Design a protein around this ligand. Structure first.
Ligand SMILES: NC(=O)c1ccc[n+]([C@@H]2O[C@H](COP(=O)([O-])OP(=O)(O)OC[C@H]3O[C@@H](n4cnc5c(N)ncnc54)[C@H](O)[C@@H]3O)[C@@H](O)[C@H]2O)c1
Ligand SMILES: NC(=O)c1ccc[n+]([C@@H]2O[C@H](COP(=O)([O-])OP(=O)(O)OC[C@H]3O[C@@H](n4cnc5c(N)ncnc54)[C@H](O)[C@@H]3O)[C@@H](O)[C@H]2O)c1
Ligand SMILES: NC(=O)c1ccc[n+]([C@@H]2O[C@H](COP(=O)([O-])OP(=O)(O)OC[C@H]3O[C@@H](n4cnc5c(N)ncnc54)[C@H](O)[C@@H]3O)[C@@H](O)[C@H]2O)c1
Ligand SMILES: NC(=O)c1ccc[n+]([C@@H]2O[C@H](COP(=O)([O-])OP(=O)(O)OC[C@H]3O[C@@H](n4cnc5c(N)ncnc54)[C@H](O)[C@@H]3O)[C@@H](O)[C@H]2O)c1
Ligand SMILES: [Zn+2]
Ligand SMILES: [Zn+2]
Ligand SMILES: [Zn+2]
Ligand SMILES: [Zn+2]
Ligand SMILES: [Zn+2]
Ligand SMILES: [Zn+2]
Ligand SMILES: [Zn+2]
Ligand SMILES: [Zn+2]
Lengths: 345, 346, 346, 346
């Protein structure tokens, strides 16, 4: 089968021919219908050998949807042909976090050698993929696969970040979204669907600000040195109830600390090595909590799928073939994909 | 009347004679029965002129209990003689936070010039004190005033910090308390009363570790370079569900980050200028939230008083006269008050 | 001044001339800009002498907005001319519930003789009204008074009922709204604004089902014997996550129990004496909680006002003069007001 | 192997010899170390043929602990010899409730024919038992099996009921426990461990009131007509924040409604066919929610085990052999087991 793999440290991913896998006991083989590209893939591929934890070769793609092609021995609860999304942050299934579906916060995965598809286990950017267990599949019914694939991370990750502090986001609240890319453009829509927060979007790119307004942002303002003052002009001196930073550079985290309200929240979602919030007296308002969330929970993925099925998420995509996978990663690097890149085999 | 005041930048507080105040409309005059000393008072008195926001002179004391001596015009809901605790973080009373009793997070207090007793308004370390409004008084009934005064901050502040994340502290959880002083020794007891968390106390001083065990800590660890590893040996690799850092020095915050669990919490309660948690990828576990809480809410103070009335809080105190106030602050500076210093006016 | 009063048991309310009140200490006099009629007023006026708790005479109207006309002694947190909404369920201000703004659940109001405007204290259906304290006023800025008056109960009550279980109403949930009147037509809009629930409206009257669709209901079902089956056809067998019953008749409560999901909720908001949910094994699904909520909280009223100011609430009203007050109550009795009746004094 | 089975409608259970089962793919065979008797077993055995849903024959016992004896094909995460407790309310594992571990509220179990061990699937009152999947086993380490078996229901069910409203049970709250039997005597201890509620126990039997005080109840009062007034004398006129009714007879539910506080909770846990709370205006206080909870969640069972391992639960038991199983059910019927009956297979 055709797949897109990261095969040597510091090189671009390549299109390869590798054997179509067969599911072992408990596993499910999917025919992949759509595979999302994520900026985390760039970050992973830019790591030096010592830090890179994905293994070589690695079939990329931690955003996967497909149709059930073959059931491994003993698998129940799915039929051949069922359209499913892959829950990505695989955990042990048995610990206190996993028992609540919070496998993203599994305390045993490292020790048991459990890794996600697309970063340690083979991903979705291939004609077929293996899923380890039935509990990592969520039905999508007749959802369009191209717009569904990003739900598994571009949808799930913002959804989880927002869910952590949803009770803060009542009528009269303001949520700032920094970075209107794959994640951020979905985050805006989640905020509008599950809260009455006023949503202020921030991006470097005027076309991404237009995208933000297109998907329901109440205001959209230019990132950089003037952003904090511009946001405060919109909120008045109270600042923003919550800031969801999908960039996570030091400059954006600094903007977040400069605008967050007393008893508010900053969610540092974007990943930029070395960047950090400075949480101390006189450096942040009283009661303003800060967290780096990771991916999301099983029940959250179901809720994301439910939002999509209800028409609440307009996922902006561009479609690529498997052969175009490496070119698509170049596009993502240069910032020329308006929303999410999606590979269709 | 006699009072203890901070009167010039960089000097020790002094005992003074100033007029007994009269309550204006809406105000209440208390005869003070006990006034707590807090380490925040030291921090405030060590600020340079440019930063110090308390005004001069300032009657110290933001931990106050008393008896109602006189009602100002129009005051209802209290009688002369009623024993009350002073809710300290005064807010506007009208904004969304204040409407929920969360006057500690009032968004209008700065703009309206509203300051707390003992830091901008006259405090409790005097024979009498003024309280601005009835909503800032909570009844204590027959609670001993000496042990009640610290409930207003040494109790309220840890209680609020813990309350922010109480749902995390289920059976099987671990809570670390760093700094077993005024706040910390009460924090341990709150954790034991309102949660099933295992409590690990951390202090530099072996006698404070003994105090921690005396008030119900399950384990006690020496602070410093070995603390993080020692805590992890106790929690077995998952780390601590929550860390309540009542010191807030860089070293203690670093210990906190090195032990906190995935999807846990660090509450930076202690105040050390410049110190901060570094919240970023690879610097803290996934999902481990960090906050600097401030004081507490109206309903939280009521709950702290309810814990005291139910026998759940053994408040360790040492009593001083008003004349001993300055000496008591020297004791607090050198770290020789085992628990909370409390001034009792006579 | 002109006012509409209930003056004798079993009679219709009458238009009267009574003195314009002057505010005492702590009170505020409002020039009323709009006064809502509520079905609870009908229920109150239909009570026999032994049950009726409003006092006689009683100026009706527990839905009030106005402009500050005169400040009582000591009141300084509002200016003359400020547009304000009246928080209705007055409490003591001092108990644990009141400290959280939850004066609707005040434990001391009965004992202290504290009653709401429009049911024991003089209401808003008059040229002017007295408000007891500043904490019972919420600013509305430039909101149209006619559409603002219903926010104080038609908005607040559903808002509180929904807020009690808002975490249940995630994507994929269904909320049923029974009764698309004053409260129900606002409840539909609150659900759409603060949740991703699919909303199914239920009414006896086709025109009210049309109103429901006009304000954002996803589906509309005829009430009565076929309603439970019709709702289940829409929800596909799991039933409805939450049912907000703004009628509260036995038939509607029965429908609610027949459609509610496992681990769901029924809020019995409508008041029909004798009607009740039967919460027992084999009579309701496992985990499906039931409550009779009452009015709402201070912070909730602020949130309702914020929804209105953000354009999220299209309040359907019909305007009446004070002279038309009694006629308007006849209209409400016969069910011919499409949304909320609102009296505008001139 | 030896087992205790319900074999014909209206008869007592009997000791039988049936084949020792072999685990199929995904299943686990346990050597049973302890099997709890529950009053639900009596209720089930007293159902007429038309209602009884357990199937015949049925190996009784929905409270099970054991050691892993044999792993079915493909089973990972447990080793032979591991001591485990059986999570009882088996669900589909895939729905939104099950994904959160809340298999007690599974929406698909009925349709898929999934039933619990001891009521549709073979139970724990046998030398060996099958568990359907690894996710239905929780490790207990070196906990004594006799005291561990009741954790799976006598512990789990009260724990879940309490957990639904734990945020209500702050300092100053009161929780009433009605019925100090298997469930109730554990419920008292859970309340003391995870909350600061004052606990008032209620039972018909003076020896069970003594048991209540032995396990940490603050007061213990006689059930029946005088109970509501007696409880109110202890709480003052505010009533009880929460009432956990482990009897669920009409008389006990009525007591619960007569004592519950405004904005409180009644959990109807005990099962008595036909009995129900009457939730309507004038029949219950404003804001007092009522629910019939069912069993508990996966993560809750882990938390119950954690309480036991921390020494917070003193489980009162009496031990029986398999041959004594039928005699033990007679004892439970007559009310002569002080706590939980537990069968230990040899
Ligand atoms: N925490 C997690 O679990 C998790 C999961 C998935 C992705 N992520 C991370 O989220 C981030 C977003 O990923 P993506 O795939 O949406 O990226 P993307 O490449 O699709 O979009 C990036 C967007 O950020 C904007 N941007 C860049 N610098 C900016 C600045 N200084 N201010 C404002 N806007 C700026 C760009 O113009 C662009 O619109 C990445 O760092 C990714 O690694 C985190
Ligand atoms: N956030 C707030 O709202 C708030 C409110 C009140 C007090 N505070 C702050 O909380 C802190 C504690 O106040 P207090 O009155 O309880 O102080 P205290 O002087 O009574 O106690 C200090 C304790 O901390 C211990 N300690 C000092 N350095 C330590 C270290 N490196 N590691 C471990 N333990 C150490 C001491 O040995 C002592 O037991 C102060 O910084 C104070 O300003 C904050
Ligand atoms: N719990 C509280 O705190 C609180 C506060 C305010 C009002 N209420 C109560 O809420 C209820 C509604 O008040 P309102 O002012 O909105 O009433 P309304 O007269 O404006 O509306 C009544 C609506 O219910 C519909 N209706 C009547 N019988 C019905 C049935 N069997 N099935 C479905 N629909 C039916 C009508 O057709 C109409 O649309 C009243 O009982 C009122 O007393 C309760
Ligand atoms: N909701 C659920 O998921 C669930 C789960 C397990 C058990 N249960 C039910 O819980 C109830 C208790 O089960 P158990 O095994 O603990 O029972 P048990 O037989 O061990 O204990 C019964 C206790 O209730 C007392 N009692 C009886 N009538 C009383 C009254 N009128 N007032 C006060 N006390 C009274 C008895 O004196 C005895 O102490 C049963 O109805 C059972 O079916 C429900
Ligand atoms: Zn990603
Ligand atoms: Zn796990
Ligand atoms: Zn202090
Ligand atoms: Zn305020
Ligand atoms: Zn009303
Ligand atoms: Zn009150
Ligand atoms: Zn049972
Ligand atoms: Zn299920």
């Amino acid at each position: 089968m055709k797949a897109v793999q990261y095969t040597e440290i510091g090189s671009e991913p390549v299109v390869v021919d590798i054997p179509t896998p067969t599911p072992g006991p408990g596993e499910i083989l999917l025919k992949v219908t759509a595979a999302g590209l994520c900026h985390s893939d760039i970050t992973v591929m830019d790591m030096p050998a010592a830090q890179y934890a994905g293994g070589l070769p690695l079939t990329l793609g931690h955003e996967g949807v497909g149709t059930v092609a073959e059931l491994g021995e003993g698998v129940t609860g799915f039929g051949v042909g069922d359209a499913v999304a892959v829950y990505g942050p695989w955990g042990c299934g048995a610990c206190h976090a996993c028992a609540r579906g919070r496998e993203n916060y599994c305390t045993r995965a490292a020790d048991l050698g459990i890794t996600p598809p697309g970063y340690g286990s083979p991903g979705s950017m291939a004609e077929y993929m293996i899923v380890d267990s039935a509990r990592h599949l969520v039905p999508i019914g007749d959802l369009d696969p191209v717009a569904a694939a990003p739900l598994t991370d571009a949808g799930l990750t913002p959804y989880h970040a927002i869910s952590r502090v949803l009770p803060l986001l009542g009528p009269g609240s303001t949520a700032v979204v920094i970075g209107v890319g794959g994640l951020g453009h979905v985050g805006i829509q989640i905020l509008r669907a599950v809260s009455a927060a006023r949503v202020i979007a921030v991006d470097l790119d005027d076309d991404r600000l237009a995208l933000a307004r297109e998907v329901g942002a109440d205001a959209a303002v230019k990132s950089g040195a003037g952003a904090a003052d511009a946001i405060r002009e919109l909120t008045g001196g109270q600042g923003a109830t919550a800031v969801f930073d999908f960039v996570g550079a030091q400059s954006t985290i600094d903007t977040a600390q400069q605008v967050v309200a007393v008893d508010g929240h900053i969610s540092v979602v974007g990943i930029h090595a070395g960047a950090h919030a400075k949480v101390g007296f006189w450096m942040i308002p009283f009661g303003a909590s800060v967290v780096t969330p990771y991916w999301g929970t099983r029940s959250e993925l179901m809720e994301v799928v439910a939002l999509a099925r209800a028409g609440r998420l307009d996922i902006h995509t561009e479609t690529f073939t498997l052969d175009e996978g490496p070119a698509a990663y170049r596009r993502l690097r240069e910032g020329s994909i308006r929303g999410r890149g999606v590979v269709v085999p």
